[PDB]
Scaffold this active site. Structure first.
Site, PDB file in Angstrom:
ATOM      1  N   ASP A  89       3.987  -3.478 -10.635  1.00  0.00           N
ATOM      2  CA  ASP A  89       3.425  -2.172 -10.932  1.00  0.00           C
ATOM      3  C   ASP A  89       4.548  -1.196 -11.273  1.00  0.00           C
ATOM      4  O   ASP A  89       5.716  -1.418 -10.944  1.00  0.00           O
ATOM      5  CB  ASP A  89       2.611  -1.667  -9.739  1.00  0.00           C
ATOM      6  CG  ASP A  89       2.072  -0.265  -9.944  1.00  0.00           C
ATOM      7  OD1 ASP A  89       1.323  -0.044 -10.920  1.00  0.00           O
ATOM      8  OD2 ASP A  89       2.393   0.617  -9.120  1.00  0.00           O
ATOM      9  N   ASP A 136       4.037   2.895 -11.517  1.00  0.00           N
ATOM     10  CA  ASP A 136       3.982   4.192 -10.853  1.00  0.00           C
ATOM     11  C   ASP A 136       3.987   4.035  -9.338  1.00  0.00           C
ATOM     12  O   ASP A 136       3.152   3.325  -8.770  1.00  0.00           O
ATOM     13  CB  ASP A 136       2.739   4.954 -11.307  1.00  0.00           C
ATOM     14  CG  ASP A 136       2.828   5.394 -12.754  1.00  0.00           C
ATOM     15  OD1 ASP A 136       3.633   6.300 -13.050  1.00  0.00           O
ATOM     16  OD2 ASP A 136       2.103   4.826 -13.598  1.00  0.00           O
ATOM     17  N   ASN A 179       2.153  -0.782  -4.910  1.00  0.00           N
ATOM     18  CA  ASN A 179       2.082   0.190  -3.827  1.00  0.00           C
ATOM     19  C   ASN A 179       0.654   0.570  -3.459  1.00  0.00           C
ATOM     20  O   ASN A 179       0.450   1.183  -2.405  1.00  0.00           O
ATOM     21  CB  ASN A 179       2.859   1.454  -4.207  1.00  0.00           C
ATOM     22  CG  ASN A 179       2.154   2.274  -5.264  1.00  0.00           C
ATOM     23  OD1 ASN A 179       2.079   1.875  -6.426  1.00  0.00           O
ATOM     24  ND2 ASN A 179       1.631   3.429  -4.867  1.00  0.00           N
TER      25      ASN A 179
HETATM   26 MG   LIG Z   1       1.317   2.168  -8.355  1.00  0.00          MG
END
Ligand SMILES: [Mg+2]
Length: 235
Positions: A24, A26, A136
């Site tokens: 990922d 961001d 995240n």
């Molecule tokens: Mg993310």
């Protein structure tokens, strides 16, 4: 900048499938904001709905070193819920001509569910024994929790070392035949294994960790590469 492999580990690696690490962007590798305090690492100019927009992008500490290392162990794939115009530009800057983040999946490949974009890993690789996702947001791998490595969301903390702290585990994980042997563990019993095949995968996983712990009892040259690895991997 990578610990030497033992003859046993090298032989094990040839006996198991190659593996994909899905990444990922961001709050995992970068954090960005648009218009509306530290200097950003790079600035993207993207026009969206034909309106020009500026994104000030901050790299998570040690992301370049992290990507350099794991690209030697896994095929890296970007999977983001961002729009391609944004996600693609970030990936270009992160790759920085190293040619390790060439495979990308964007919003049009995510499934929306209960306000969360789900990243169906089988879009990238349907052999779930050999694919891993570092994200995240737990909602992103809601359909594949057994293949997920969670990581704290990052926004600005300059003291973050999470990418460094993941390297030995990601190293050891690539010696398993099925990554789920390890990632499926992470209620009353003390059993980490439920089969002989999973138990063998943990033996291989732990064997590589053993090489990390006891690397300083090796001869001069192997011991010098060990001290370098430990001083670089925040240990
Ligand atoms: Mg993310």
């Amino acid at each position: 900048d990578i610990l030497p492999l033992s003859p046993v580990s090298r032989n094990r690696l040839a006996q198991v499938k190659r593996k994909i690490l899905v990444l990922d962007l961001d709050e995992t590798l970068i954090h960005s904001h648009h218009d509306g305090g530290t200097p950003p690492d790079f600035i993207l100019k993207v026009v969206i709905d034909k309106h020009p927009v500026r994104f000030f992008v901050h790299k998570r500490p040690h992301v370049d070193f992290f990507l350099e290392v794991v690209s030697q162990w896994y095929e890296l794939v970007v999977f983001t819920a961002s729009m391609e115009i944004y996600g693609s530009a970030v990936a270009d800057k992160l790759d920085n001509s190293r040619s390790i983040l060439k495979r990308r999946y964007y919003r049009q490949h995510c499934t929306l569910e209960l306000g969360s974009y789900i990243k169906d890993l089988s879009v990238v690789h349907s052999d779930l024994s050999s694919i891993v996702i570092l994200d995240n947001s737990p909602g992103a791998y809601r359909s594949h929790p057994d293949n997920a490595i969670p990581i704290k969301s990052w926004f600005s903390d300059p003291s973050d070392t999470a990418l460094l702290n993941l390297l030995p585990m990601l190293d050891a994980l690539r010696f398993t035949a099925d990554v789920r042997s390890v990632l499926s563990r992470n209620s009353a019993k003390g059993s980490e294994s439920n089969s002989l095949e999973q138990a063998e995968d943990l033996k291989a996983f732990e064997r590589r960790l053993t090489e990390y712990i006891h690397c300083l009892q090796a001869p001069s040259i192997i011991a010098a590469r060990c001290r370098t690895v430990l001083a670089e991997y925040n240990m």
